[PDB]
Enzyme design. Sequence first.
Site, PDB file in Angstrom:
ATOM      1  N   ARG A  54      47.479  32.934   3.769  1.00 49.74           N
ATOM      2  CA  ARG A  54      47.408  31.512   4.090  1.00 49.74           C
ATOM      3  C   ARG A  54      48.769  30.889   3.880  1.00 49.74           C
ATOM      4  O   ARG A  54      49.287  30.896   2.773  1.00 49.74           O
ATOM      5  CB  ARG A  54      46.389  30.779   3.214  1.00 49.74           C
ATOM      6  N   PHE A  59      53.709  22.779   2.623  1.00 49.94           N
ATOM      7  CA  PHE A  59      52.718  22.916   1.564  1.00 49.94           C
ATOM      8  C   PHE A  59      53.052  24.099   0.662  1.00 49.94           C
ATOM      9  O   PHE A  59      53.690  23.937  -0.390  1.00 49.94           O
ATOM     10  CB  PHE A  59      51.281  22.920   2.124  1.00 49.94           C
ATOM     11  N   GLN A  62      50.564  31.362   0.343  1.00 45.53           N
ATOM     12  CA  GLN A  62      49.570  31.949  -0.557  1.00 45.53           C
ATOM     13  C   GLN A  62      49.377  33.429  -0.258  1.00 45.53           C
ATOM     14  O   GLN A  62      49.314  33.834   0.902  1.00 45.53           O
ATOM     15  CB  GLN A  62      48.229  31.214  -0.411  1.00 45.53           C
ATOM     16  N   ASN A 101      42.997  29.469  -7.001  1.00 49.36           N
ATOM     17  CA  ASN A 101      41.721  29.584  -7.687  1.00 49.36           C
ATOM     18  C   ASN A 101      40.569  29.074  -6.854  1.00 49.36           C
ATOM     19  O   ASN A 101      40.773  28.500  -5.777  1.00 49.36           O
ATOM     20  CB  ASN A 101      41.771  28.931  -9.085  1.00 49.36           C
ATOM     21  N   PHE A 112      50.367  31.295  -5.217  1.00 47.19           N
ATOM     22  CA  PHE A 112      51.104  30.630  -4.151  1.00 47.19           C
ATOM     23  C   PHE A 112      52.485  30.218  -4.598  1.00 47.19           C
ATOM     24  O   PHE A 112      52.737  30.034  -5.791  1.00 47.19           O
ATOM     25  CB  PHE A 112      50.320  29.453  -3.536  1.00 47.19           C
ATOM     26  N   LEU A 121      48.004  19.170  -7.341  1.00 44.38           N
ATOM     27  CA  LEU A 121      47.455  20.387  -7.935  1.00 44.38           C
ATOM     28  C   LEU A 121      47.671  20.451  -9.450  1.00 44.38           C
ATOM     29  O   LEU A 121      47.159  21.356 -10.110  1.00 44.38           O
ATOM     30  CB  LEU A 121      48.023  21.634  -7.247  1.00 44.38           C
ATOM     31  N   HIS A 125      45.668  23.811 -10.920  1.00 45.07           N
ATOM     32  CA  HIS A 125      46.187  25.174 -10.790  1.00 45.07           C
ATOM     33  C   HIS A 125      47.207  25.448 -11.876  1.00 45.07           C
ATOM     34  O   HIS A 125      48.014  24.577 -12.214  1.00 45.07           O
ATOM     35  CB  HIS A 125      46.797  25.378  -9.404  1.00 45.07           C
TER      36      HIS A 125
HETATM   37  N1  LIG Z   1      40.439  34.575  -7.739  1.00 48.50           N
HETATM   38  C1  LIG Z   1      40.390  33.890  -6.588  1.00 48.50           C
HETATM   39  C2  LIG Z   1      41.343  32.913  -6.300  1.00 48.50           C
HETATM   40  C3  LIG Z   1      41.287  32.200  -5.098  1.00 48.50           C
HETATM   41  C4  LIG Z   1      40.281  32.464  -4.161  1.00 48.50           C
HETATM   42  C5  LIG Z   1      40.193  31.693  -2.823  1.00 48.50           C
HETATM   43  N2  LIG Z   1      40.437  30.284  -3.140  1.00 48.50           N
HETATM   44  C6  LIG Z   1      41.426  29.579  -2.599  1.00 48.50           C
HETATM   45  O1  LIG Z   1      42.142  30.003  -1.689  1.00 48.50           O
HETATM   46  N3  LIG Z   1      41.507  28.323  -2.991  1.00 48.50           N
HETATM   47  C7  LIG Z   1      42.562  27.480  -2.447  1.00 48.50           C
HETATM   48  C8  LIG Z   1      43.784  27.579  -3.377  1.00 48.50           C
HETATM   49  O2  LIG Z   1      43.766  28.233  -4.426  1.00 48.50           O
HETATM   50  N4  LIG Z   1      44.911  27.090  -2.903  1.00 48.50           N
HETATM   51  C9  LIG Z   1      46.225  27.238  -3.483  1.00 48.50           C
HETATM   52  C10 LIG Z   1      46.990  25.998  -3.022  1.00 48.50           C
HETATM   53  C11 LIG Z   1      46.675  26.496  -1.590  1.00 48.50           C
HETATM   54  C12 LIG Z   1      45.076  26.479  -1.592  1.00 48.50           C
HETATM   55  C13 LIG Z   1      44.668  24.993  -1.832  1.00 48.50           C
HETATM   56  C14 LIG Z   1      44.381  24.348  -3.048  1.00 48.50           C
HETATM   57  C15 LIG Z   1      43.953  23.022  -3.063  1.00 48.50           C
HETATM   58  C16 LIG Z   1      43.716  22.331  -1.883  1.00 48.50           C
HETATM   59  C17 LIG Z   1      43.926  22.966  -0.670  1.00 48.50           C
HETATM   60  C18 LIG Z   1      44.371  24.287  -0.643  1.00 48.50           C
HETATM   61 BR1  LIG Z   1      44.612  25.055   1.090  1.00 48.50          BR
HETATM   62  C19 LIG Z   1      39.335  33.442  -4.456  1.00 48.50           C
HETATM   63  C20 LIG Z   1      39.388  34.152  -5.656  1.00 48.50           C
END
Ligand SMILES: Nc1ccc(CNC(=O)NCC(=O)N2CCC[C@@H]2c2ccccc2Br)cc1
Length: 164
Positions: A54, A59, A62, A101, A112, A121, A125
């Site tokens: 991603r 931004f 990831q 997460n 990321f 965040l 995070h």
């Molecule tokens: N252990 C584990 C960690 C993440 C996942 C999938 N979750 C995930 O991708 N959540 C989105 C996240 O962590 N982020 C990092 C900043 C990029 C994306 C994000 C966070 C907050 C709002 C939008 C986004 Br896109 C599955 C298992």
Amino acid sequence: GNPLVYLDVDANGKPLGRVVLELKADVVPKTAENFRALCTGEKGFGYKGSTFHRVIPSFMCQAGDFTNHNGTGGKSIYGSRFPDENFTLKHVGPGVLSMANAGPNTNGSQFFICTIKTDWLDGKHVVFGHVIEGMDVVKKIESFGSKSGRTSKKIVITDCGQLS
Ligand SMILES: Nc1ccc(CNC(=O)NCC(=O)N2CCC[C@@H]2c2ccccc2Br)cc1
């Protein structure tokens, strides 16, 4: 001192170069140790061969799902998930290294690298390091992203490890 680790990254089989990351073990030792060991692969698994799944311009980029290779997976050296260590470090700008997460206390291996200040965040995070060298590589990766996060090239961590 704090570990320095590296990610060598390809896009469509072409080397982009090396991202060097400082892991802030002084602040978040458990989170730093996880990432360090996943870079060396010393537990028998880790980031080598995994992708940036991603990437969203202006931004972040990831990566780190080495179990499902699609953004749903990953695991830590401790077990499948581990707690948020603290929120002491903040998402201050480009180059910040932080744990992806699925809500509180769900850190695994996904991470990321920020390409802007992602202050929203903070407190959500766990930040655990930053780019020491190779922001040019990060900007290249960023340019291969899209609004939805879908990448327009196959972005692969071909090699990784610990420098110090
Ligand atoms: N252990 C584990 C960690 C993440 C996942 C999938 N979750 C995930 O991708 N959540 C989105 C996240 O962590 N982020 C990092 C900043 C990029 C994306 C994000 C966070 C907050 C709002 C939008 C986004 Br896109 C599955 C298992």
